[PDB]
Amino acid sequence: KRLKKRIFAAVSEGCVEELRELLQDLQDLCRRRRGLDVPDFLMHKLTASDTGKTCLMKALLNINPNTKEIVRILLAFAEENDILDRFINAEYTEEAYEGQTALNIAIERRQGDITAVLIAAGADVNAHAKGVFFNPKYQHEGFYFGETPLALAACTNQPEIVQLLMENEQTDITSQDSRGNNILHALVTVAEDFKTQNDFVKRMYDMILLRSGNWELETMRNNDGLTPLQLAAKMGKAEILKYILSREIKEKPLRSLSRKFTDWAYGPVSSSLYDLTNVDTTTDNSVLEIIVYNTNIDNRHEMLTLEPLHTLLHTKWKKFAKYMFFLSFCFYFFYNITLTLVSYYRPREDEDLPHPLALTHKMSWLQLLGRMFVLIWATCISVKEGIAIFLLRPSDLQSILSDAWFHFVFFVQAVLVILSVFLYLFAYKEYLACLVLAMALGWANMLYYTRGFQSMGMYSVMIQKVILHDVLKFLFVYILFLLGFGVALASLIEKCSKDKKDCSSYGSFSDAVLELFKLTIGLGDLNIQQNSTYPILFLFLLITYVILTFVLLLNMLIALMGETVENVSKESERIWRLQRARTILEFEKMLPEWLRSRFRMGELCKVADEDFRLCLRINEVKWTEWKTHVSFLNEDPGPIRR
Amino acid sequence: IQKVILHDVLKFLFVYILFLLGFGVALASLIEKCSKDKKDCSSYGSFSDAVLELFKLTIGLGDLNIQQNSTYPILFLFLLITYVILTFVLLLNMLIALMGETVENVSKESERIWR
């Protein structure tokens, strides 16, 4: 039993000749077995049976400059007893580390010279690491690299080892993970949002697709059923989407895997084509649908900045979304005018105003139009906006100053006009009292229509901002002194100075605060005349309320001025442009009937005789680094007709 | 002065009308078929009576429409105070939107136009 433990720390410290002695003494203990299973005898001596850790893993946790001598001796001993393949590919039977091999930990400690020895040993390069260290609580003890030694080499900046592991022919790339990930799902889920964090994931995801792999890499679905790029969309990874979605390949033999297409080259001016297969909303689960309809992403405004996304939203604005907007504005605008035209009441006089709205059995063909006209849209919104509540489970009002909260507030207005007439047929006395609440909320609904005017649309965002993030700061302090100084006035007005008995009619403490409410508005009451006990003290109390309010308004400004010269001028545009993008796709899902007027550019040539390949998009570039050009498709043409 | 009127006031005015015409509805129904008192002297209208008395809140009247009231007339001022604070935010956002990196632009943009 001491032989197993003495041989560990000799290796972990790196005792050279002491290792050779206990090796030779183990050879004496080899022949102690009569000729029986010398393989299975050494599996208990060279490996602790508790964790399954061999003697070679403890050799590879620690490292000193003896280790290169240590490894070549201990592997030669594994050669001389013919157990090498079971030995070099041994793992941990422990549940925490089911799959940690010696090749895995060698790449972690970044020893490429030892790495070539273990490949010369013929270790299993296709090993998996399905241990507990996934950890769905990712912010500790995780590092989900995707279980494979290649991606572990790919993740932790070991490109020479990646170049080494690629050249071995028994090295899979097409392997999958417990989450269904390939290797090139795994690089996406590591690449953090630090701009050029000596950035390499953009460089090494380059270095795998360009080394090998045809189009049978990026169509593989995981357990979620996603591409690399669909996974690149949902996780909000910014900069790795920029490489995957531009990707010019200025070579001959493998530019079929590219993503950009330079069409012309006429010196400075140059028309270029972007690929657009799984990007436009034309299939299920398109990546532009993923970006808009998602929470959990802070740099989403940088996601829609990239050119084969930004121009496509601007295209669908100019042909579909702008025209479908102002009609649904004006139809909602007439809906809110005509409902108000009940309360303006052009006849100005009848018996009782005996209805919220009703059709006239005798005359008033104009009133025959309008009372039907409000009732139809009232049904139309409830049919429409009940579905948006019915679909969206997680994203309701988490971002309070976002959308999918006005879908509630549209729905409240459409119910109450129906609930008006539903009350009017049963006559529960609350005819108007439900109606007027609907009529005011209809005008409050009009803030949602304040988009599309880029001057105005920036202004409406901060009105939602100040009310729900700064007013409630101000209001809870303003109540706190209101309820403070009102006490010192109510005791004056009740059991003290004033005059003979007064006409209160609601209360006494409430009388003071109501007369102190109006100081923000103006009354200048004769409570100063309804006074004694030096009534100058009343105004010296009352003036010290006003100045104390005036500071509370000033601090609200300055706290809203917290580096506001750059933030809220960018923060509003960050919300507003996104809030436009949610409107557009709702219209793009509204009529899936005749999409003859989308943009496709007519599936131009890819590489091979499969010219009519995929539907594209044109952008145009400019000066600054002239060069020669062999990359194009067509012999410097123009808007060719043929 | 030419800048603010034709590029920022019309932003502010179209939102200011939008709540003016909003909260005036909730006051006009109070003043017509509800609480107030016995019959009043309107002389122009009823919905227009509310908005005209709600116009002056930006100016000052402090009318006896609070006395021309019932149905817990504290609710009238709690309606009316929530108009004033709602206006006060609309003036604040107009400032901050005009403060959009304004420390360098409009001090240069005016000189750009004026010269």
Next chain:
Amino acid sequence: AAKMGKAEILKYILSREIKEKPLRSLSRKFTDWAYGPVSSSLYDLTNVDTTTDNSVLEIIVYNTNIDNRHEMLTLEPLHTLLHTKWKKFAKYMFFLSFCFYFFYNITLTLVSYYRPREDEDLPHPLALTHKMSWLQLLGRMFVLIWATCISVKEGIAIFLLRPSDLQSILSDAWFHFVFFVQAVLVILSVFLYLFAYKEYLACLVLAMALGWANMLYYTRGFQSMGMYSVM
């Protein structure tokens, strides 16, 4: 190094990794793992936590004469430890002492709102009813108990702190006065009421307003709001 407010020399003395064999026992950081990018590390924490007398985190908070004190609590084996004691002890002990003080200031005000709305003279600031009103039996005792409790509590903070009273005027240890003023005057109300020197309410209302002015101290803990109350 704590008391003199020396910033950067505290950063070396309190991280201090020693990547050697023979003398890393004098180190102050301890790297526990190394798994490529992710790495869990251990910080030493002997004379730092409040577990002995004169701990260095006690020195930093309770001190004047330091301008870069906000940079002192920025360092990681201090900042995370305050955030730890917030999440397990300080947050829960705060909102109860908020709500207990909040009911203390509502119930005192409920004398002046005066739900009966009419009696002979309002003949008392607060008094227990010998006949009825079990609800009034609760509240009048309830104000008087905390009134004793604050004076026992906040008299000690005046009794301890000699130098740092209101030197930084916009700092704490000045509200410990203003809590104490309110607790005296409610006692001084009834102490006046038994001797009948005509100033029953006139001392009471000054206590009742200052109780609401005391509520600014409770405006911490909401990081949005707590920045606003300082200015």
Next chain:
Amino acid sequence: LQRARTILEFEKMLPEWLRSRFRMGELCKVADEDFRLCLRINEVKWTEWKTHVSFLNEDPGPIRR
């Protein structure tokens, strides 16, 4: 800073049952005096990969034993 003055006043308020402080359980220092001093965990990240001979335990996780 004004938060930090509140917290220690509560930490001095009930010195009665401080069973629920943080200590991490006096992990190994260097020598056979393993149970040495009570500690605190923080976690670090990318940017300058290197080899490592500095650690204490054989790349474990939330170890149970």
